Structures are given as structure tokens and as C-alpha cells.
């Protein structure tokens, strides 16, 4: 199974710079050109540079939106790919993928990662508040997950076993710092008979968060 | 430079239904030594990564449903889906490989549904909220059709619009539909003065609005 995971993303202030990695499996690495390719939140993908596979010397090439700016490498030995950027603004504020691409013959991106999520700003990292919401033959339940900055966070249900009837609303900035909720609705044969958590994570302030909803 | 244009921006297709949409090259994406033209397009799902659908304009890749289908050469390519289903809902991007690359703009395809109330809850401010001094009042408005929705929030029957988070998601992949929140956040000092909290929606499927209500002394 091929494999791409990038890391790295994060809080970044104007003018600094941030690397980010993405790690590979699955395939003949060199074999491979690698892309990347970013996206600001609810823009389109914009193509940022590619380095060539060993056939091609593994040569670099960049859009003229980033040349001279970002620069990527490539660890032939461990088949990890990065992406070195530098005099970060804020329209460089984007989710960035690593995408396999040309092998000398498909033209293709064949696979993509899940995105690691870069924020330039000069506003501090803040955690979130995370409150249960109870009630005061279907039951809804949520979590209000307030206050926090950079974006991303993450909500599950049970560790993940509860998917379906999962809402988890866009996160929403208001006075520099987001808010998101998300709702959950279950038999109510089955709450509170059986236990509901939310479970968020805030990947900058390393926040881990299990909140039970108690009737 | 090369130059890719997509349309249309967006459109809304029922269910079974065709779904055609265009994408445009400022040049010729056609290879005289390969006779391929350089012309791939990506499916991006809400909150997914971008997936590859069909490459050399007209190949579509192992795994990709055969509704799909690309077609066109040279400055204008197509993609077609027949018998659209809900999990479709996405943008679709074309991308050139003729000169190193370059994405259009996408195309954001919506599913037409019948229309569907919300299911409507409202939930108070926790004691652990409430503690550090906030009061932040939720409601959901879960699972109806189409997006546009009112939402009015009443303090002791007197409508307030100061104080208010909406947020809605993208649509359903499975149902097509939306859902929204809506948040109203208090100081503890305020909430306190009042009693009735109401939620009020109003959507195009009922005449009357959806009233969901909490009363402080009852908690
Ligand atoms: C092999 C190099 C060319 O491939 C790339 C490149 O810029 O690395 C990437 C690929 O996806 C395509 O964009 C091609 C583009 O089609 C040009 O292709 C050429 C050009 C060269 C060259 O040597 O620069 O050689 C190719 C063949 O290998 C020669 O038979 C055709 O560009
Ligand atoms: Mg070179
Ligand atoms: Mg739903
Ligand atoms: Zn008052």
C-alpha cells in the first residue's frame, strides 16, 4: 500500500521559515518524481514545485509564486521528502501536500498525503475550552470546542467507533480565536446507558481532551 | 505561461442525473512525440485530499467508477459523470503536465435534493463554562435541505443578534444534506438576568419556525 504523510505544519510568524517533511512507502521512491502542492483554506490547489527522480539527476523546479524562496530535497535513504520555506506571509498560510508524480512515462499525480496545515500569523497558540453539551427516540449530543488558535483540531466520537450521525461544524474565527462544535445523535435506548466522549486534540498546544456527556 | 481555466464555478445535479463541466488550457496540453495530451483531473471530497479520477485527458485510473469520464484534446477538455450520486458531491480540478504544472480553478459540484426540515436542539451553558465566567448557548439545526436557513434567538421573548456564531457544513455525502450551528455567547453576569433561552428556526419547509427553548429554573 502506498503511503504519504506529511509533518511539519504549524504557527509561524511573518518573515520566518518552516520545513516541512513528508514521509513515503510503498513504492520505488527514486523512481519518482515528487510535486508539491498547496491550498489555502477554501481556495483552489495551487502547484508549487516538483524535484525530478534519479533518472533525471533529481533536479528542482518551482512556480514562480515560490522560486528563490522554497526550496525542495529529497532523502534517497530513507524515501522521506521535504519542503524548505522561508519569508513566510500570510498568503502562504495554506494546507501543503506532497503528491508522487512522474515515473519517465504516466503522467499522473498518482497519490497524495492527508495535508499538514501551515498558519503565518503573529498571534500566539491558545488551547481550546472544550464543553459537553447535554439536554437540558433519537438523542443529539455535542462538544463546543472554544477559543483556540492556530487551526487545525481534530473531534472524534468513542475513539472514532462512533462515525455516522456525526456533525463537526467549520471552525469559525471571531476576535482572533476559533471556535467549532460538533454534534453526535445516538438511540436514546443508548444514552445514558452508554457512555458518549468527545475527544479533541489541538495539535499546537499538544492539547488531548476526553469529555464525557453527563446527563 | 500556461493559463488553466475551469467552468462552472459551481452547479447543483439530482441524483441519476448527467454532470458536465469544462476546462480550458491557454495552450495546446497535445504532445507531438507521445500524442498524449497532459491533462489530468482530481476529486476533492469536503475535507479530503484531492484523489486522481482521469489522466491523459481520456484514461480513467484503476478503481475510479465508470460514470466517470474524460474526453476532449489540445486547448478544452471535459468531464463527465453520468448517473451522479451523492458521494460525488465535490470540486473537481483539472491539471496541465505539459510545462511543469498548473491546476484550474475547480469546479464545485453540489447534489440537488428534495427539500428536508431541520431537526432542531438546543443545549445550555456547562457548569464548567459557566465557572470561568462565559455562558455560550448551542443550537443545532441538523439535516435539511436546501442551506438557506433563518435562525432568531429570543432572551426572555425578546429577540438579540448581538453575540452570535453560525457555521455551516458542507453537504452530506450520503443524505445531501446541510447542517448548521449556531452559537450565542454570554458573560455569566448576563445570562443570569433572563430565564428563557430560545433557538427559532425558519426554512423554506414549514411556515412555522422550529422553536426549541430552555428556561434557567429548570436546570
Ligand atoms: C524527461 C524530462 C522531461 O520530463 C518533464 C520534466 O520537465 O522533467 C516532466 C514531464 O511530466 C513532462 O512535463 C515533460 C515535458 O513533456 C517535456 O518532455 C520532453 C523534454 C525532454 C528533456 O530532455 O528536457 O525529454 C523528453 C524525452 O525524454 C525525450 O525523448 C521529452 O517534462
Ligand atoms: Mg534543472
Ligand atoms: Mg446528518
Ligand atoms: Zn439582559
Known amino acids: 500500500e502506498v503511503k504519504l504523510v506529511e509533518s511539519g505544519g504549524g504557527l509561524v510568524q511573518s518573515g520566518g521559515s518552516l520545513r516541512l517533511s513528508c514521509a513515503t512507502s510503498?513504492?520505488?521512491?527514486?523512481?519518482?518524481?515528487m510535486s508539491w502542492v498547496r491550498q489555502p483554506p477554501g481556495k483552489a490547489l495551487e502547484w508549487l514545485g516538483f524535484?525530478?527522480?534519479?533518472?533525471?539527476?533529481?533536479?528542482?523546479e518551482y512556480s514562480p509564486s515560490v522560486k528563490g524562496r522554497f526550496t525542495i530535497s529529497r532523502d534517497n535513504s530513507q524515501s522521506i521528502l521535504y519542503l524548505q520555506m522561508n519569508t513566510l506571509r500570510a498568503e502562504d498560510s495554506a494546507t501543503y501536500y506532497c503528491?508522487?508524480?512522474?515515473?519517465?512515462?504516466?503522467?499522473?499525480?498518482?497519490?497524495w498525503g492527508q495535508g499538514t496545515l501551515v498558519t503565518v500569523s503573529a498571534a500566539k497558540t491558545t488551547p481550546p475550552s472544550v464543553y459537553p453539551l447535554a439536554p437540558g427516540s433519537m438523542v443529539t449530543l455535542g462538544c463546543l470546542v472554544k477559543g483556540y488558535f492556530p487551526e487545525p483540531v481534530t473531534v472524534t466520537w468513542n475513539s472514532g467507533s462512533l462515525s455516522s450521525g456525526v456533525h463537526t461544524f467549520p471552525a469559525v474565527l471571531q476576535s482572533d480565536l476559533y471556535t467549532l462544535s460538533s454534534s453526535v445523535t445516538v438511540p436514546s435506548s443508548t444514552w445514558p446507558s452508554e457512555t458518549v466522549t468527545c475527544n479533541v486534540a489541538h495539535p499546537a498546544s499538544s492539547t488531548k481532551v476526553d469529555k464525557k456527556i453527563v446527563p | 505561461d500556461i493559463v488553466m481555466s475551469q467552468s462552472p464555478s459551481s452547479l447543483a445535479v439530482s441524483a441519476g442525473e448527467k454532470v458536465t463541466m469544462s476546462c480550458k488550457s491557454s495552450?495546446?496540453?497535445?504532445?507531438?512525440?507521445?500524442?498524449?495530451?497532459?491533462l489530468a483531473w482530481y476529486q476533492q471530497k469536503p475535507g479530503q485530499s484531492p484523489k486522481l479520477l482521469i489522466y491523459?485527458?481520456?484514461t480513467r485510473e484503476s478503481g475510479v467508477p465508470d460514470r466517470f469520464t474524460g474526453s476532449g484534446s489540445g486547448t478544452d477538455f471535459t468531464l463527465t459523470i453520468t448517473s451522479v450520486q451523492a458521494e460525488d458531491l465535490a470540486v473537481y480540478y483539472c491539471?496541465?503536465?505539459?510545462?511543469?504544472?498548473?491546476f484550474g480553478g475547480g469546479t464545485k459540484l453540489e447534489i440537488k435534493r428534495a427539500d428536508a426540515a431541520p431537526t432542531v436542539s438546543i443545549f445550555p451553558p456547562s457548569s464548567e463554562q459557566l465557572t470561568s465566567g462565559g455562558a455560550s448557548v448551542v443550537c443545532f439545526l441538523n439535516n435539511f435541505y436546501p442551506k438557506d436557513i433563518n435562525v432568531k434567538w429570543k432572551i426572555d421573548g425578546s429577540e438579540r443578534q448581538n453575540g452570535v456564531l453560525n457555521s455551516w457544513t458542507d453537504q452530506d455525502s450520503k443524505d445531501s444534506t446541510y447542517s448548521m450551528s449556531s452559537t450565542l455567547t454570554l458573560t455569566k453576569d448576563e445570562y443570569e438576568r433572563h430565564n428563557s433561552y430560545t433557538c427559532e428556526a425558519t426554512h423554506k419547509t414549514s411556515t412555522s419556525p422550529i422553536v426549541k427553548s430552555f428556561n434557567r429554573n429548570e436546570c
Open positions: 491523459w485527458a481520456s
Open positions: 510503498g513504492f520505488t521512491f527514486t523512481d519518482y518524481y
Open positions: 495552450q495546446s496540453l497535445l504532445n507531438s512525440r507521445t500524442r498524449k495530451n497532459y
Open positions: 503528491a508522487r508524480d512522474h515515473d519517465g512515462y504516466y503522467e499522473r499525480f498518482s497519490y
Open positions: 491539471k496541465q503536465s505539459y510545462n511543469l504544472r498548473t
Open positions: 524535484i525530478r527522480n534519479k533518472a533525471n539527476g533529481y533536479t528542482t
